Nucleic acid binder design. Structure first.
Length: 90
RNA sequence: GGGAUACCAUGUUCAAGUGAACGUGGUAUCUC
C-alpha cells in the first residue's frame, strides 16, 4: 500500500459525496534544508482523522491520505453513511 | 551538475476498483 493512487481512490472514490465534505489543510514551517508538511484530513462535521506530517509537501499529501486509509473500517462506515443518508437536512 | 521547498504557465499519465498526483519550462534560496 502506502501509495497516492490507492489513497485518493479510497478517500475520494470510496468516500466523499454530494453531501458532507471533508478537506485537507496543510500547515508547516518549510525550510530550505529542514522541510516539514502536516495535513489535516477533517470532515464537515469537524472530524479530523487523516493527519499526515512528512518531511516534504508530497509525503504530507500522500501521508495524510494514507493515515485515513488506515481506518478502512471507518471509510466503509462512512460509505454506508453517505448512502444511508435520508437525502435531507431538517 | 545531482537534489528540495516555494511560485507561475501548462501538460502527461496512472489506476481501471474509479478518482487523483506528479512531471516539465523558467526565477529564487538553500544544499550536496
Amino acid at each position: 500500500g502506502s501509495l497516492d493512487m490507492n489513497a485518493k481512490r479510497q478517500l475520494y472514490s470510496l468516500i466523499g459525496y454530494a453531501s458532507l465534505r471533508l478537506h485537507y489543510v496543510t500547515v508547516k514551517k518549510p525550510t530550505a534544508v529542514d522541510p516539514n508538511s502536516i495535513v489535516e484530513c477533517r470532515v464537515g462535521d469537524g472530524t479530523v482523522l487523516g493527519t499526515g506530517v512528512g518531511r516534504n509537501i508530497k509525503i504530507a499529501g500522500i501521508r495524510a491520505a494514507e493515515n485515513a486509509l488506515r481506518d478502512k473500517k471507518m471509510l466503509d462506515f462512512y460509505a454506508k453513511q453517505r448512502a444511508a443518508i435520508p437525502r435531507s437536512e431538517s
